[PDB]
Structures are given as structure tokens and as C-alpha cells.
Design a protein around this ligand. Structure first.
Ligand SMILES: NC(=O)c1ccc[n+]([C@@H]2O[C@H](COP(=O)([O-])OP(=O)(O)OC[C@H]3O[C@@H](n4cnc5c(N)ncnc54)[C@H](O)[C@@H]3O)[C@@H](O)[C@H]2O)c1
Ligand SMILES: NC(=O)c1ccc[n+]([C@@H]2O[C@H](COP(=O)([O-])OP(=O)(O)OC[C@H]3O[C@@H](n4cnc5c(N)ncnc54)[C@H](O)[C@@H]3O)[C@@H](O)[C@H]2O)c1
Ligand SMILES: NC(=O)c1ccc[n+]([C@@H]2O[C@H](COP(=O)([O-])OP(=O)(O)OC[C@H]3O[C@@H](n4cnc5c(N)ncnc54)[C@H](O)[C@@H]3O)[C@@H](O)[C@H]2O)c1
Ligand SMILES: NC(=O)c1ccc[n+]([C@@H]2O[C@H](COP(=O)([O-])OP(=O)(O)OC[C@H]3O[C@@H](n4cnc5c(N)ncnc54)[C@H](O)[C@@H]3O)[C@@H](O)[C@H]2O)c1
Ligand SMILES: O=P(O)(O)OC[C@H]1O[C@@H](O)[C@H](O)[C@@H](O)[C@@H]1O
Ligand SMILES: O=P(O)(O)OC[C@H]1O[C@@H](O)[C@H](O)[C@@H](O)[C@@H]1O
Ligand SMILES: O=P(O)(O)OC[C@H]1O[C@@H](O)[C@H](O)[C@@H](O)[C@@H]1O
Ligand SMILES: O=P(O)(O)OC[C@H]1O[C@@H](O)[C@H](O)[C@@H](O)[C@@H]1O
Lengths: 409, 409, 409, 414
């Protein structure tokens, strides 16, 4: 059994490796092989990895992408198209037009996606022509990419992950002194655009208790939970509190800048660190890798476990089309991911899901036709996208900034 | 055969009557009966109407709604819940929050709907229990009210009308020196939120020619039509050019106030007019008349003719739910309206249609439950609604302004 | 404008030509070109045709299928795969097994379809690579072939026709002394498996009077119409009165043998006839001609007219999948066929439609895979098919008899 | 936390097996009392006295004189009564025969008259449960899938779970074949109760479908589907499909042998005599075809009580389990069962061959329910004609009349 990691130089790799080590007493892992376009960076992160693993498994570096995935049972997509410079443009350029600039949400999600599609296209193609492995995806925007792979590349074994579900389950498990697996949710939406309607702990409906603990400037007021009656992904603030979020983003250093500082600091510690450092929580992406590990674990056994994952709706939410990729709770058993019935989704949640899904497909369509025209159409459709008067200048600036990664005609 | 007109005192009534006189050669009309809450205003209008009609058919006033609709085959809703004063509040109140203020679109449409629902609820109930007439609805917001009547009151014979379709058809017929019925459209969306994908004149696909013509003709730039490839309802400006529209509305006289002036000038003229005054074109409701008379005419015969009308999708647009009320082309014959297959809707169009439909149903739900909390939820879901920080104060202003017409708890 | 007729040697050809001559005053027809695998038989018929036509248009014979369809705007499929010998096997073989033997219904329909599929595959392929004509199909089983072409060959411009709708409309038109176009139906089902729920004449619901008339008229008893409340295709007798129909078919001359006789008498008459002989009424295919000519006519103009036709459901019946090919009323205008909203189908009708549609697809699957195993599966799925104990011998007998036309492994 | 199970039809001869099942799960979940109700007090008393001897005071065993008294404080209610008794079953099987029609307890015309007898009793019972305990109802009463369609979609009582014994019997057979546990076996399984199909078989995650098909060929002779059938159809079929696909053979069998209902009366009279003194469940209870219904119900209740999450094949709304069937079809399908809830699992597309039966019988089911709700003789004729195994037009009226006269104590149609 071999796991390939694509983006082995990530500063989260130590966390992933820890995760793999914890399951490696319930599932046989013979090797973990790392690939990165940045050989010097990766070497450092993998050298640390090897001091953590201590021969419990083989740890390998492949010079090529093919060479990693060729024997792999699982491939983890962990790379950042365009680097932190890409992310800086994603965050900074939309501001100049009065728009939300954010890594995965709105115009920033649009350019990040455009940079991501050609790489995942090449990579999915290689995996399919070789090992036909299950691909586990962190690369953002993760739900958008999952929509693209499942419904346009039509590669079934591509599972989109993100950290908000596991984080929420962890808050709840802590809140009620229970295990993660004791928590069961009615959960649906898109990646970074999700809604929680019911919370169960050990089978007890604790939704009401959860709402009340949520009440006890930049967080939803109490009346909001009373009115909407959904627990809402924090990313919904960019939609529902746009003016407040814009004011925050536009008066401080960019978020990419400060993660870049956290990373540099981590890398320095990784040169000599024998234990995983603490400053690896100052990263808002924590627990992504723990979600990954538990997922691979439960894909490998025949126990049958629940994981909230990006995949085709297939009836999970009865009033959304089957083909919508959503972030939803699934029954994971023996290489298979089974969608679970949840009933109906709330009209308030659907107003966002529908809108952003349409935007997602228009973006993909623009990409496949490499069309500037269609890209403007996609940009105009996003609930946080430009007005007509700014749209064409915005796109121009995105294309200029991203010309090493995206070419549209 | 009797036609009831509810809101007889409308300044558009003369044009409606002209329309009715024109089809009166094709179909038998024995009487037109008028009802209005404002008897003195309606009396001047109806006196003028009698002068135009010259006993072509009987013209009556009923002192009650019930008296107007009891023996009617067709009932026309052309009343304005809350009057021009309500429209003034609709337009003016959102402005201080940085929000679009407009008669039918956005927050203004929300308050207009809340004023409309109790009145239409009583009116539909009375029609249903008496004549079971077909109701033809102009009252705004027309599509939203149709969604309410068809899907919540479950009165089948309620047809929402608007004047955009017939005006577009007219423009095309003039462009190509053809008759109205020669023009056939792939047309879908919501009332004031509609899209044209294909134009046929005498069977020829002339879509390109129409796009080419739009460029020669506050409007969407040429690249917009190249990009989006849809002909767009002018009201889409409020979504797509929000900043530009907000600036325009907020630095000029409220539309409601200019209509007040226009109406006062029309009413003085109506006292002695022998013919319809040209000044009735200063209103933006022209051709509403033709649309209603033509619909009634083709409801009466067994010919079978196409009318674009607000009704349940029923498979007109295959990637939208059957139950969505849409404004779409239907085959109209002998009292029945049959939806026509049109294929798939464009994702760009769907992004708007879905979001606003979810807003429509949230608004209806808040009304049916008489719920302040659910009204907040509805308001937040509109693409043109308030941020969380403004929503409470805005709703409280709306409910205070409309306290005579609606009560939420 | 050119119309291709495939199977020119048909005894119905003269009637088709009469139909085409009748529309030739409303629409331009330059030439009708005939193709048949039996040159000598066709020549006799075509020579007769020429005497009827009077050079009103050009009458041509093509030596090849390709030569017939190359410049054609319309292509009429009116050929019988395997001839009346095939039909004889169709009707006779299932009787030994205690099964209904019939040209289009049940096991006979199965073997008839198998014979047809290779020929229509080649033909549809040639048409789509050349003229891309609209194909109008008489060839039985018509609905089944339509399902094959629309959903498996994916050729959109294939319209399946049958003569029961037009004959039923004619019966009603005559009952109420009205024109064909005055009659409007709620009609749905499969070809030879159809149901009428509502009858309108000039807009008036006359359904009750039709039911009342049916009882003043092997037929369904009065109580049947009272209980089921559907007017039923006469072919439903083979399902609902199987025992009676079996007894009838099995104690009388096979219908195929009778039509051999009839055809031999017609063909001798055609040598000298100046007008269409009355003896052509002895065939049950009458009015097929009007149905096709009228369809072609209304496909050619921009009027918009109703024709009952085999095409994709597309929301016409809301509780049947969109992709079911059904026989339903459509609005036909300028080369397009639009499906019309009809509401819900009756569960009694659905019981038959679903089961036969599943049989249809199983049959197509078996053909596409050239699979004997899958053919057994298809055979067993038919409500009038063999029990398990007879299936193998029955199929073996069918494949042996049709060895020249179908090869399964 | 004190937990009570009601058993409706306590006098059933399967009750001892149900109790054995409940005893077995009583180590994993707390059961404080099992309360029994039956319309036939004297028959139930013999069975319950035997039950008390087996329970050995592990939980309280009670008899309620009324239905209401049984269900009032119940967390689970088990429907295991036969409307009209074995004499209703006798009429069900016997009456269609003279018309050349299949006569069977649950399938075809017999199922139709059985459903009509059941509907009024379940209507009353579900109404009482809903107005008191709002318990989960676990249903054995036949026809079980049809009654679930009726309760879920027309009475709109969500917590009604239809059960049958074929899924568990199949799962047991597979587990035996491969030396595995029941829970190691996972199926692509769908259809209607007594009208179900297996497309895929997994044991400990391995696809063993082929091996299972190969095994079927090696395995009541003239009544099994021949090998070519499995090669052709490529579905493992519920044995009840024999009545549809082997109709002439099944009609001949049923009509030239004693009515099953009459043999069951003999079997039952021997069981009841034994229950007077029995210390252990008699082997003669296997002579009944209902075995393992017990385990299925107890295992269901067990996993409804914990927060583990386990798979049970159960009758419930499709909700996307089979993507090419409507969501609202009640089907018999694998569900994730956890903490009082039943979640449907994605299975992909159903086979057209299977859909031909499922659609036709589902339409028949709803037409039957509609006839009953309107108390309509006309609509009952229409339902009867819709069933693949129903009468030709020429027989439908006389057949319906016979059925209504035999069932006049239980149903009245106008
Ligand atoms: N790894 C996690 O647990 C985690 C957590 C949160 C978010 N993410 C998402 O995963 C992605 C990685 O983010 P990160 O935080 O690890 O930052 P990161 O910048 O350290 O990215 C990881 C590595 O990917 C490499 N890379 C870039 N392009 C590549 C390509 N074409 N092929 C192979 N490698 C390439 C980079 O050299 C870098 O070392 C981002 O899109 C991020 O949003 C991951
Ligand atoms: N008349 C048209 O063809 C037309 C054209 C464009 C828009 N509309 C829509 O239809 C409505 C009519 O507005 P308008 O500008 O024509 O005229 P308007 O504002 O003068 O109102 C029409 C009449 O309705 C009456 N009215 C108010 N409430 C009523 C009630 N509860 N019952 C009966 N009558 C009542 C008023 O007294 C007035 O005489 C508006 O909602 C408008 O958006 C109508
Ligand atoms: N023509 C009509 O208006 C009409 C009416 C009823 C039914 N049909 C259907 O259409 C078909 C024709 O019926 P029919 O009574 O004329 O029978 P038919 O025996 O007269 O056959 C018609 C002609 O088709 C020709 N033919 C056979 N195979 C061919 C092939 N592969 N390519 C081209 N031509 C071929 C035959 O030689 C024959 O001349 C049948 O399937 C029938 O069910 C047609
Ligand atoms: N019990 C099981 O595990 C099992 C097994 C196979 C099939 N079934 C289905 O369950 C039902 C009962 O099966 P059975 O073989 O035990 O039959 P059964 O004849 O023994 O009936 C069971 C009990 O129900 C009682 N009863 C009848 N009407 C009642 C009513 N209205 N209220 C309460 N009790 C009533 C009878 O007195 C009898 O004691 C049948 O419908 C059968 O098809 C059950
Ligand atoms: O700013 P960062 O440290 O990169 O964290 C950003 C991360 O935040 C998490 O809450 C989101 O769910 C992730 O999808 C995202 O990658
Ligand atoms: O300002 P007004 O004269 O009232 O015109 C307002 C009107 O504008 C038209 O363009 C809309 O289609 C109408 O539905 C609307 O009511
Ligand atoms: O027996 P025949 O003369 O060939 O007539 C048979 C014809 O009967 C009609 O009622 C059917 O609608 C046709 O589809 C069929 O071909
Ligand atoms: O004749 P019986 O003993 O009543 O057994 C009949 C039983 O057989 C099983 O195979 C069925 O799954 C049961 O639902 C049925 O009731």
C-alpha cells in the first residue's frame, strides 16, 4: 500500500504524516512518496518527516509526478498553484474594485481556480492512465475543483476535502465531552459555503443547546441564529457581512502575507525539530490532514464510517439536483463513498448554493473553451463579483497577473 | 361574457378599454365592470371610458369587489396596494442603507409584496367561492404574487402578466417589418428578471442580427452581449450595475413622486378628453393593455396562440424545477395555458432565477406565518437586500411604514 | 424541397402521394424520390403514382438509399424489415407457446424490432452524414424505433408516427361536426399503448359525452370506462383481454396471410388504376398518409399546429421521466416539435407505460450488445412475454426464423 | 431511559422467537418491559406463559387488555398481527384459483384482499400510536411493503419501518458461504417487499458477485430459475418473482396442492399444544417460513437504540437510494440505522428489468390505497386490473365481488 503526496514541501506535511502514523496501526502503509516542483523546500519538510516516522514506514521522494502516483493507492493533492504570490494577487486585486479579496471566496476563488484547472487536468489524467488511485484533494478552491473533476473530467475517485466540517465536529465533541464519531450532523452546502441544520451527540438532538452556546462585531448577532435557524460556515460572513468584511480586509496587510510569515518561521524550526512545533496552530488550515488520514483509514476498512466530504449530491439533499457536488456527510466503506439521505435543504441555504454552483460551472466552461468572453460571464455571475462597469478591467488585471498559469483568448 | 376590472381608477384603464374594444370584434364582450376603493377617482376615469366605448359593450361600476367578480369570466387585477404613497416608501426607505430602492426589485419589491399578499388572499378567496374566473394580474410584484397564488393559495387560474415580453416582441416585429405573432422567442426567467436566448422571425433564427442591432442602437456595453450571449431584461441593470443604479436613484426625484405629478395631469385631462392623451406614454406601463386583451381574446377562442406569461414551469425549462413560476412562452387556447418545451436554461440566467425564487418563497413563508424573524431571513436572502448590520433597522422601518397593510410578530 | 420515401413499393404509397398532393398547394414540393429494395414491385406503384401526380411535382426513383436521401429535406421510413414473411413469423411463432402473436405488440413486436434496428441504424447513419433530413417514421414498431433513434443513436430529427391518434381525432371531429384542428386531447402513452384522459372540441370539455357515446357504440364493457375513466388504445385489448385475444388470433387466419392476399389484389389493380381503389381501405393503415403530409406541412410553415407524435416526454407528462419517448400532442412549427404541458398521468396508464418502456430499453440493449443472454432478459420483461419455461425455446425459434436479419451471440 | 417494547399480535406462534431475539440484544441495550396485546386473549396467554418461562425474569413481561394500554409508554411497537386470521389467508389464496389466477398470501390478488383487510386496522393503530407515544413502529404484518407505502405516503407517519425476512436470510446464506459475519456482507439490493433484486454482493469489501452466481448453479427442483436465467438477467431475484416469471408453473403447483393457509393451521395447532409445556423453542417452528424475522426486528431495534450506525435492509422511502426511481417510492433497500433514524444510502441506478416490475407493482399499490381511501368499488376494480397478476377484464367484476363478500367483516366498499 502506497500513498503519494503532491506538494510535499507544504508546511502542513508534518501534520499529515502524523495522521498517517496514527492510522498505520489500523491500516498497512508501506510507503509515502512525496513530489513537489520545489525540490529544496520539500527536502526540508520530508527530512523532518523522516525523523518523525523513524522507519515505521518507507519515505520516498519522486523526481516526477508520474513517478509518485504510478504505484499509489491514494494520491493527496496538497499543492498551491501559483504559490503565495498567486494568493497575494487573489487577495489584493479585487480590493482595488471595492470587492472582497479572499483565498477561496469570490474573485480570489475565481483566479485560484483558473490557475488550478490545467494542473489538476494534467494530474488527474496521469493518475487515470496509471494507478487509477483515489485522489484526496486539499488544493483550493477544493469544492470547485471537485465539481470540475467529477462532472467535467468525469474521474470518479476524486474526493474533495476541507477543514470546516472536522473543526465544527471537534468544537461540538469538546462542548459535550464526547468523541468525534459521537457527533452527527445534518450538513450541506458547498465547500466554504455550508450550513448546519441539526446537531446530534450520541443520538441526542442538541441543536438548541448548540444555538444557545453560540450566543454565550464580526460574528453573527444573536437575532441572526434565531431568524435564520442555521449554523453557518464562517465564510458566509463575506456574503452576508460584505461591507464589514471589506472594511477589515482593506485596512490591514493581506492574509497571505501573514501566513507567509508563519510558514517561514515553521520552515526554520523544521530544520531541527524532533517534535511537531506549536506554531503549527497559528495556521487556520489545521486538521485538514487529520481529516485526510481518517478518510484513508475508513476507505481501507470495512467498518463503515461517516465523513463529510465533497461529492455528488445523489439524493442527499432532495431539493438540489443529483449532479451538484456538495460538501455532505457520507458513509465511507471499503473504497466506496455512499451518500446519505438528509431530506430537504432550507431555501435560505439554497439561494447561496444554487448561485455559486452556477458560477462554478460558468468558470469551468470558460476554462475548457479558454475563453475571455466566457470568463467575464462567469465573473459577472458571482454574488461577490464585479459590476458591469468594473468587470472587464478586473478580468484584464487577473489575466495579466496570472499569465504564467492561465491563458484565455 | 363579463370582464371585471379591479382598480378601475388606474390611469391606464383607458388603454385597457381600447384593448378590449379592439378584440370585441373577434370575441363577444357583454359588459366590463369596474371596482375601486376610491370611488371619486374611478368615476372620472370610467366617465371617460364610457365616452370611448359608445355602447359597444355595457360599462358598469360595482360598489364592492364581490359585485364586480360574481358573474365575471375574467378578472383583471390592476390595483396598487397602498397607493403611490406605498411606492414612495418602497423606493425611498432602502436608500439610506445604501440599497436599491425600486418599485418591484429588491427591498422595495419585498415591501410591496407584503402589502399585496393580504389583499390578493381575500380577493382570490372571493373569486374562487363565486365565479371561479380566470384572474389576469398586473398588480406588482406580478411574478412574485403569481408564485404566491399558484403555489400557496393553489388557485390554478391566476395568470401573471408584465409588459416587457410584448414590448420586446413589438421591437422585433418593427425591426423585421413583421407581425407580432411572427416573432417567437426562447424566453425565460422571472418577471423583471428574464432572459432571451433565441429570436425567431417567421421561422428564421435572427438572434445574431438582433445582437448586432443592439450594438448600433446605462445600457449594457457591447462586450456584455458578446460575453453573456443573452438579451437581458432591463431590470437586470439593478443587479449587474448596482452601484451605477444606486447613484442614479439616490440623486434624483423618486420615481413615485414623478408618477404622482404625471397622474394628476392625466386625471385633469380625463375630465374632458375625447381621445386617449399622448401623456399616457410618459408612464412605463404602456402595452400592458394589449397584452391583457390579446391574452383574453386567445383564452376565448380555440385557435391556439403564443403568449409569454407567468405560470408554473412544467418542463418549459428542463433544468429548473417544474413548480417554479416563471415568465415563459405558452400555448394559449380555450381557457387553458400550456407550457412549451424550450430545452435548457443558461447557467448565468439560472444564478439569478434560483436566488430570487428562494427569496420569493422565504418572503411568502414569512407572510403566511406572520413572522418578523422569517421576514429578516427573507430580506437577507435577496441579492439586493441588506447586510446583517442593516437588516433589523431596515425591516423595522418597513413594518412601521406599512403598519396599515401588514402586521408581523 | 425534396421528400425521400423509403419503401416506395408499399401498397399505401398512392395514399401518401395523395396526401402530399393535398399539401402541395400550401407548401412547395419540387420532387418526391422513391427507394425500395424490390425494384419491380416499386415500379408498378410509382408508375401509378405518376398517373395520379400529373407532373404537379417531379417523381423520381433512386437505385440507392443514399441517392434518395442526399438532397432530401424530409425522409419517410415506410419499409417493412423482413417483409410479410417476417410478419407471418412474428404472429405465428408465439402462438405455439400460448402467447399473443401480433405485428407490433408483445413477442411479435420484439422480433419485428430486432429486424428493424440494423436497417434503421444504417439508414439514420447515412441521413445524418448527408442531408441531415427530418425523418418521419411509419416502420413498425414505430414508438420502439423512435426510442432507439432518439435515445441510443441520438438523432434528434426522428419523428415516430402512428395512425391511431389521427383516426381518433377524425372520429371526434365527425361526432361533433367540427374540423380536425378543433379537437384537442389529453393523450399520452406509448405507440399502440396510449390513453386519452380528456377530449375538447372547440374548447369545450366533451369528455363525458364521448364516454357516453362509447356505450351506444371484443370491446371494453361499459363498466370498464366507468371504472378506469380512460379512453384506451384498442391494442390494450391484448394486455387486458389476453385470453380472449389469444383465442381469437389462434383460431383464425394469421393477419399477415390476409394482407398478402389483399396486397396481391391491390398490386394487380395498380397496373391500370386511374384512381385509388376502395380496396385500400381493407388495410388498417389508412390515414397514415394525412398524418405524415400534415406533419410535413406544419413543419414547413410558421403557423404552429398540434400533432400527436412520438417524441421525448420533456415534461409533457410530469410524473414520467423526461427521456421516455411517448406518443403525445406537440406544437409543430418551423422544423421544430415542442412538447406541451399536460399535467400528471394516471397510475393505471403508468403501470403499462413503465413496464413496456423498460422492455423497450432491454430490447435495445440486447441488440446493441448482440447478446442472446440479454435478449432472453428483454423477452422475459414483456408483460406478454414467455414464462421462464418457454423463453429459451421461443428465442431460439425467433432467432432461427430471423437469421437473415439479426445475429445474436 | 426506562424502555418499553409493545408487541401487537402476541398470540403469534413466532412470538417465542421474537422474544429470543429481544433477549439476545438485552445485553447490549436496556429493555425494561415487553408488553403484549392480541384480540384473542386465550391464545396469547398460552404463548406469553411460555415466553415468561424463557425470559427467566430478564425483563418484565406484561399483557395489556387493550391496544392503547400496550403502546402508551412504548418506545417500539411491533406489528405482527394477521388481519382476518388464517381464514382470511385461506380466502386470499383460494378465491383467485377458480379464475386461473395466482392465489398467494402476499402476491397478486391475495395480497390485494390482504391489504384491504389491513388498512383499516393499521389506520386505527397508527392514529393511536401517533396521539400517544409516537413510538417507532416495526411492521411484519403482510403485505408489509404495501402497508409501509400506505403509512409513509398517505397517513404520513414517518416512524413506520416495514420489515420482511428475505434480506436477512440472504445475508445469512452469504455469510455462511464465505465464513463471515452478517455485518461483513454488503449488498446492492432494491425493489419492493417480495419483489426485490440483488445486483452486487460484497463480503468484507470484496466483490464476490460472480462467485455467488457460480454458486447458485451448483445449489424443490423444477421451481428454481435455470442457470441461463442468471447469465441473462444478471440479478439475484427474490424467490417470489417465481409467481410473475413462472406463473403457469406456480398456478399449477398451488392449485393441485393443499392451500398453504390450511397447512399452517395444522402446524399452528401442533405448535400451540407444545407451547403448553415447552421449556425450549420447539424445532417445529422452522416448518414456518417466517424464521429470522425475529433477528431482523431485534437487530433493527438494537441499532436504532445505539449510536453505532449499522446497515439494515428495510422498507422505507427511496430518497435517492436508487437514482432512476422516484424519491417517494417506498422500497426495500439498505439503510444506515443510527439513534432512532434510518438513512438511505446511495446505490446508483436500478436495472430496467427490475424497474419493469417495481414500477408496475408500485402503481398497483397506490391504486389499491386510493380505492380504499375513497371506499370505492370502481377504483378497486381499476387497482385489481392494474396488477401484473390480476384478472382479465372478463373476470374482474366477479372476482372483486367474491373478495368483498368474503371480507365484509373487515372492509366495505361502495
Ligand atoms: N496541506 C493542508 O493540510 C492544507 C490546509 C489548508 C489548505 N490547504 C490547501 O492546499 C493547498 C496547499 O496549501 P499549503 O498551505 O500547503 O501551502 P504551500 O504553499 O506550502 O503549498 C504546498 C506546496 O505545493 C507546491 N506546488 C505548487 N505548485 C505545484 C505543482 N504544480 N505541482 C506540485 N507541487 C506544487 C509548492 O511548492 C509548495 O511547496 C492550498 O491550495 C491550500 O488552500 C491545504
Ligand atoms: N394598469 C396597468 O396596465 C399597469 C401598468 C404597469 C404596472 N401596473 C401595476 O399594477 C398596479 C396598478 O398601478 P397603476 O399605476 O396602474 O395605478 P394606481 O397606482 O393609480 O392604482 C390603481 C388603482 O388601484 C386602486 N386600489 C388601491 N388599492 C386597492 C384595493 N385594495 N382594491 C381595489 N383597488 C385598489 C387605486 O385606488 C387606484 O385607483 C401597480 O401595482 C403597478 O405596478 C399596472
Ligand atoms: N405506408 C403507410 O402509410 C403505413 C401504414 C401502416 C403501417 N405502416 C408500417 O410501415 C411499414 C410498411 O407497411 P406495408 O404494409 O407497406 O408493408 P410492405 O410489405 O408493403 O413493405 C413496404 C416496402 O418496404 C420495402 N422494404 C423492405 N425492406 C426494406 C429496406 N430494408 N429498405 C428499403 N425498403 C425496404 C419492401 O420491399 C416493400 O416494398 C410496415 O412496417 C408497417 O407497419 C405503414
Ligand atoms: N411474526 C412474524 O415474525 C412473522 C413471520 C412471517 C410473516 N409474518 C406476517 O405477520 C403477520 C402475523 O403472522 P402469523 O403467522 O403470526 O399469523 P397469525 O395468524 O398467528 O396472527 C398473529 C396474531 O395476530 C392476532 N390478531 C389478528 N388480528 C388482530 C388485531 N386486529 N389486533 C391484534 N391482534 C390481532 C391473532 O389473534 C394472532 O394471535 C402475518 O401478516 C404474516 O404475513 C410475521
Ligand atoms: O490563512 P490560512 O492559514 O492559509 O488558512 C486558510 C484556511 O482556513 C480554513 O478555515 C479554511 O477552511 C481552509 O480551506 C483555508 O485553507
Ligand atoms: O414608473 P411607472 O410609470 O409606474 O412604470 C413602472 C413600470 O415599468 C415597466 O418597465 C415594468 O415592466 C412595469 O411592470 C412597471 O410597473
Ligand atoms: O393488418 P394491417 O392491414 O397491416 O393494419 C395494421 C395497422 O393497424 C392500425 O390500427 C395500427 O395503428 C397500425 O400501426 C397497423 O400497422
Ligand atoms: O406459510 P408461512 O409459514 O406463513 O410462511 C410465509 C412467509 O414466507 C417467507 O418466505 C416470507 O418472507 C414471509 O413474508 C411469509 O409470510
Amino acid at each position: 500500500m502506497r500513498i503519494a503526496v503532491i506538494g510535499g514541501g507544504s508546511s502542513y506535511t508534518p501534520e499529515l504524516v502524523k495522521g498517517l502514523l496514527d492510522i498505520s496501526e489500523d491500516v498497512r502503509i508501506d510507503e509515502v512518496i512525496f513530489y513537489d516542483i520545489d525540490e529544496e523546500k520539500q527536502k526540508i519538510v520530508v527530512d523532518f518527516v523522516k525523523r518523525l516516522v523513524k522507519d515505521r514506514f518507507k519515505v520516498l521522494i519522486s523526481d516526477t509526478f508520474e513517478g509518485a502516483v504510478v504505484d499509489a493507492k491514494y494520491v493527496i493533492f496538497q499543492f498551491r498553484p501559483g504559490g503565495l504570490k498567486g494568493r497575494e494577487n487573489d487577495e489584493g486585486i479585487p480590493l482595488k474594485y471595492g470587492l472582497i479579496g479572499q483565498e477561496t471566496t469570490g474573485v480570489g476563488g475565481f483566479s485560484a481556480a483558473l490557475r488550478a484547472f490545467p494542473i489538476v487536468e494534467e494530474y488527474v489524467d496521469t493518475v487515470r492512465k496509471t494507478s487509477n488511485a483515489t485522489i484526496v484533494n486539499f488544493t483550493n478552491p477544493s469544492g470547485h475543483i471537485t465539481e470540475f473533476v467529477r462532472n467535467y473530467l468525469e474521474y470518479e475517485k476524486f474526493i474533495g476535502l476541507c477543514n470546516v466540517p472536522i473543526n465544527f465536529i471537534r468544537e461540538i465533541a469538546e462542548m459535550f465531552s464526547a468523541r468525534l464519531e459521537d457527533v452527527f450532523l445534518k450538513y450541506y452546502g458547498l465547500n466554504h459555503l455550508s450550513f448546519i441544520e441539526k446537531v446530534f451527540v450520541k443520538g441526542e438532538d442538541v441543536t438548541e443547546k448548540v444555538f444557545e452556546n453560540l450566543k454565550l462585531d464580526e460574528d453573527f448577532p444573536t437575532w441572526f441564529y434565531d431568524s435564520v435557524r442555521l449554523i453557518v460556515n464562517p465564510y458566509l460572513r463575506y456574503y452576508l457581512m460584505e461591507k464589514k468584511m471589506f472594511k477589515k480586509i482593506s485596512t490591514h496587510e493581506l492574509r497571505a502575507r501573514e501566513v507567509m510569515k508563519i510558514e517561514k518561521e515553521l520552515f526554520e524550526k523544521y530544520r531541527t525539530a524532533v517534535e511537531i512545533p506549536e506554531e503549527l496552530t497559528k495556521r487556520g488550515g489545521s486538521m485538514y490532514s487529520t481529516a485526510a488520514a481518517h478518510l484513508i483509514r475508513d476507505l481501507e476498512t470495512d467498518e463503515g464510517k461517516i465523513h463529510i466530504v465533497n461529492t455528488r449530491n445523489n439524493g442527499s439533499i432532495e431539493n438540489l439536483p443529483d449532479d451538484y457536488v456538495l460538501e455532505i456527510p457520507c458513509y465511507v466503506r471499503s473504497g466506496r463513498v455512499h451518500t446519505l439521505s438528509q431530506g430537504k435543504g432550507d431555501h435560505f441555504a439554497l439561494s447561496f448554493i444554487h448561485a455559486v454552483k452556477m458560477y462554478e460551472r460558468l468558470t469551468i466552461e470558460a476554462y475548457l473553451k479558454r475563453s475571455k468572453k466566457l470568463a467575464l460571464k462567469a465573473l459577472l455571475s458571482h454574488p461577490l463579483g464585479p459590476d458591469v462597469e468594473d468587470a472587464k478591467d478586473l478580468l484584464e488585471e487577473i489575466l495579466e497577473a496570472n499569465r504564467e498559469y492561465v491563458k484565455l483568448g
